[PDB]
Amino acid sequence: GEIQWMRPSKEVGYPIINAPSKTKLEPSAFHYVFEGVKEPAVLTKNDPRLKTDFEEAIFSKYVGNKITEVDEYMKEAVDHYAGQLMSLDINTEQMCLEDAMYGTDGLEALDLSTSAGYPYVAMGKKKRDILNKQTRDTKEMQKLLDTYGINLPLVTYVKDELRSKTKVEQGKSRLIEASSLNDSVAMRMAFGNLYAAFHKNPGVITGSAVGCDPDLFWSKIPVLMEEKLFAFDYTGYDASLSPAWFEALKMVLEKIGFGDRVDYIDYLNHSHHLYKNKTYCVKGGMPSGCSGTSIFNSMINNLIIRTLLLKTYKGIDLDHLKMIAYGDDVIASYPHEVDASLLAQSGKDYGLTMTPADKSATFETVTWENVTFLKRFFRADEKYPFLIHPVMPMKEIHESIRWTKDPRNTQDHVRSLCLLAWHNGEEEYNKFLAKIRSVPIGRALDLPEYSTLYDRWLDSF
Ligand SMILES: O=c1ccn([C@@H]2O[C@H](COP(=O)(O)OP(=O)(O)OP(=O)(O)O)[C@@H](O)[C@H]2O)c(=O)[nH]1
Ligand SMILES: [Mn+2]
Ligand SMILES: [Mn+2]
Ligand code: NA
């Protein structure tokens, strides 16, 4: 991913975009009952905390495009992966504007809370002003489509979330590249059925975990994995992606019956962006707020891992590559051990910064004891070991609970944390409930007891 140019939006007929300069995050009722070292990410260039140019820091994620074409390995990876997906019978039909808007089996309705992007975010129009769950009115959308078309600029927003102290001082705030509602609707129409197929088939055949339910899914994973596990995390995956990777992606779409709309993928690749008063163009890089981002990111990852394997271990049997990805996050396995550090090396030649899974200092052996996927661990239940607990560290949970965006969602927010936490064991969960109930707000919430959660879990399978 690399920025080709950037200049004043007025210089090209575009309005300056307004983005709140104030975080919605504020200390919560539990701010002092729990330990935490994260603060609301920098949202503006002014933020007193800064220690380097904001503007520069945020965009540095666009490290450049390391590769130019789709080499032999990438092509073989394309063939093999496209091969597996072929065994899914993925319906190649377009998705009717209705289902694409209010959802259907295997796909949720568009999210009404998130932006609507240009031009609507500059005309003042909002999402609830275009559709409604009970009506399922295509007409209003339809008109806007005919009126403004597709391929509309991406409105870039700085993401309002918690970040480490360093990532604050280095203005390393993450960006949300929101795509116009039109575009999103189009893409959901073109790739609607693909999305469903994936959401409904998390596993090693899609090599995707998107739309999965950790409480149930963690138990199917080990069965799917091969003997030896390997993993690593990417540094700025999305932005590092070169145009070649998008092509490989189209080659895959093409082979599975979507050669039809591979055009849409071009839009994610060669991007048109609006950030404040400035406008820029990006060659490569996956936009963060786009319909399919998650899935396409995962499909590309299936291609990447296959590529570095064919390139490094000639003769390797991909049919025994068992991997599951979720965007940049991946968990893989092979009958034989492989050198992650070595694969990481080939990664650079392909423009990817891969590192020891979980900020390790070095690439060590990956085991069921130390492997994590989605920040979660795998831990067999003491009473019925054949059931696996997805275990999120408490530190993460402690961090999230010390803050709040909307006081009216404290019930839902804490409840959620509880659904993650209890897997850390009953003793641990109770200490958590205890502290929560050590202040008025907590004591007022409706939280599930350990035994309630654990039983409900046992029956869920
Ligand atoms: O809205 C956004 C923006 C960014 N991202 C994601 O954030 C990633 C980069 O933004 P991060 O701040 O998470 O950096 P990092 O995780 O790569 O840092 P390290 O672990 O390597 O030290 C990208 O690779 C993309 O997956 C989102 O998921 N959503
Ligand atoms: Mn990462
Ligand atoms: Mn990740
Ligand atoms: Na881009």
Q: Is the alpha carbon torsion for 268, 272, 278, 283 positive or negative?
A: positive
**Cα 278 to Cα 253: distance, rounded to the nearest angstrom:** 34
Residue whose CA lies nearest to ligand 1 atom number 16: 235
Q: Position 268: which residue type?
A: L
CA of 356 to the centre of ligand 2 (A): 11
Query: What order of strands is seen across the sheet that includes strand 270-275?
Result: 2-8, 278-283, 270-275, 154-158, 175-179
Q: By the 8 A CB rule, do 27 and 166 touch?
A: no
Q: By the 8 A CB rule, do 25 and 405 touch?
A: yes
CA 453 centroid distance within chain = 27
Q: If residue 444 lies in a helix (H) or strand (E), which one and from where to where?
A: helix 440-444
> To 10 degrees, what angle do helices 181-190 and 138-148 make?
110
CA 266 centroid distance within chain = 20
Q: Which ligand approaches the C-alpha of residue 240 most closely?
A: 1
> To 10 degrees, what angle do helices 293-312 and 192-200 make?
70
Q: Which ligand approaches the C-alpha of residue 239 most closely?
A: 1
Q: If residue 179 lies in a helix (H) or strand (E), which one and from where to where?
A: strand 175-179
**Cα 388 to Cα 18: distance, rounded to the nearest angstrom:** 46
Peptide bond before residue 119 is cis, with ω within 30 degrees of 0: yes
**Cα 155 to Cα 159: distance, rounded to the nearest angstrom:** 12
Beta bridge partner(s), residue 366? 229
**Residue closest to 447 by CA, chosen among 459, 436, 460, 458:** 436
Report the atom number in ligand 1 closest to the C-alpha of 174. 3
285: left (phi over 0), alpha (psi -120 to 50) or beta: left
Cβ-count burial 251-288 (b if 16+ within 10 Å, e if not): bbbbbbebeebbebbebbbebbbbbbebbbebbbbbbb
Report the atom number in ligand 1 closest to the C-alpha of 173. 12
Q: Which ligand approaches the C-alpha of residue 330 most closely?
A: 3
Q: Position 461: which residue type?
A: F
Using only C-alpha atoms, the chain has a radius of gyration, in whole angstroms, of 23
**Cα 451 to Cα 461: distance, rounded to the nearest angstrom:** 17
Q: How many CB atoms lie within 10 A of CB 353?
A: 15
Q: By the 8 A CB rule, do 291 and 260 touch?
A: no
Residue whose CA lies nearest to ligand 1 atom number 28: 288
Report the atom number in ligand 1 closest to the C-alpha of 297. 26
Q: By the 8 A CB rule, do 116 and 127 touch?
A: yes
Q: Position 436: which residue type?
A: I
3-state secondary structure of 70: coil
Q: What residues flank ion ligand 2 with Cβ within 5 A? A: 233
**Residue closest to 41 by CA, chosen among 32, 50, 33:** 50
CA of 98 to the centre of ligand 3 (A): 33
Q: If residue 441 lies in a helix (H) or strand (E), which one and from where to where?
A: helix 440-444
CA of 438 to the centre of ligand 4 (A): 47
Beta bridge partner(s), residue 233? 355
Resolution in A: 2.6
Q: Which of 174, 326, 359 to mutate to test the pocket of ligand 1 (most atoms within 8 A of CB)?
A: 174
| Residues having CB within 6 Å of any atom of ligand 1 | 159, 172, 174-176, 233-238, 288, 327-328
Q: By the 8 A CB rule, do 364 and 356 touch?
A: yes
Q: At a CB cut-off of 8 Å and minimum separation 6, what does 320 contact?
A: 226, 334, 335
Quick one: tokens of 304? 């990447």
Quick one: tokens of 343? 């694969």
Q: By the 8 A CB rule, do 334 and 197 touch?
A: no
Q: Domains in the chain, ordered, with CATH?
A: 1-13+70-202+243-284 (no CATH), 213-242+292-367 (3.30.70.270), 375-461 (1.20.960.20)
Q: Which of 63, 168, 235 to mutate to test the pocket of ligand 1 (most atoms within 8 A of CB)?
A: 235
Length of the chain in residues, anyone?
Answer: 461
Tell whether residue 317 is among the known ligand binding residues: no
How many helices and strands, by DSSP H and E, does the chain display? 20, 16
Q: At a CB cut-off of 8 Å and minimum separation 6, what does 177 contact?
A: 154, 155, 156, 157, 271, 273, 287, 288, 289, 290
* Segments in 63-209 forming alpha helices (H): 72-86, 97-102, 120-123, 138-148, 166-169, 181-190, 192-200
Q: If residue 403 lies in a helix (H) or strand (E), which one and from where to where?
A: strand 403-404
**Cα 333 to Cα 314: distance, rounded to the nearest angstrom:** 17
Residue whose CA lies nearest to ligand 1 atom number 19: 235
Q: At a CB cut-off of 8 Å and minimum separation 6, what does 313 contact?
A: 338
**Cα 418 to Cα 397: distance, rounded to the nearest angstrom:** 9
Cβ-count burial 136-153 (b if 16+ within 10 Å, e if not): eebeebeebbeebebebb
Q: At a CB cut-off of 8 Å and minimum separation 6, what does 223 contact?
A: none
**Cα 199 to Cα 191: distance, rounded to the nearest angstrom:** 12
**Cα 108 to Cα 111: distance, rounded to the nearest angstrom:** 8
3-state secondary structure of 183: helix
CA of 120 to the centre of ligand 2 (A): 32
Q: How many CB atoms lie within 10 A of CB 5?
A: 8
Q: By the 8 A CB rule, do 191 and 261 touch?
A: yes
CA of 272 to the centre of ligand 4 (A): 7
Q: What is the DSSP letter of 257?
A: I
CA of 233 to the centre of ligand 2 (A): 5
**Cα 112 to Cα 260: distance, rounded to the nearest angstrom:** 29
Q: How many CB atoms lie within 10 A of CB 211?
A: 18
Quick one: tokens of 443? 């004591």
**Cα 232 to Cα 309: distance, rounded to the nearest angstrom:** 14
Torsion of CA 271, 272, 278, 283, to 10 degrees: 30
Q: By the 8 A CB rule, do 261 and 190 touch?
A: yes
Return the beta strands (E) in 181-277 as ranges: 228-230, 232-234, 270-275
CA of 233 to the centre of ligand 3 (A): 6
**Angle at 77 (CA atoms; ends 73, 83), nearest 5 degrees:** 150
Report the atom number in ligand 1 closest to the C-alpha of 234. 21
Report the atom number in ligand 1 closest to the C-alpha of 289. 1
**Cα 195 to Cα 247: distance, rounded to the nearest angstrom:** 19
| DSSP track, 277-340 | TEEEEEES---TBSTTHHHHHHHHHHHHHHHHHHHHSTT--GGG-EEEEETTEEEEEESS---H
Q: If residue 345 lies in a helix (H) or strand (E), which one and from where to where?
A: helix 340-349
Tell whether residue 328 is among the known ligand binding residues: yes
Q: By the 8 A CB rule, do 40 and 25 touch?
A: yes
Q: Which ligand approaches the C-alpha of residue 359 most closely?
A: 1
Quick one: tokens of 308? 């570095």
**Cα 290 to Cα 21: distance, rounded to the nearest angstrom:** 23
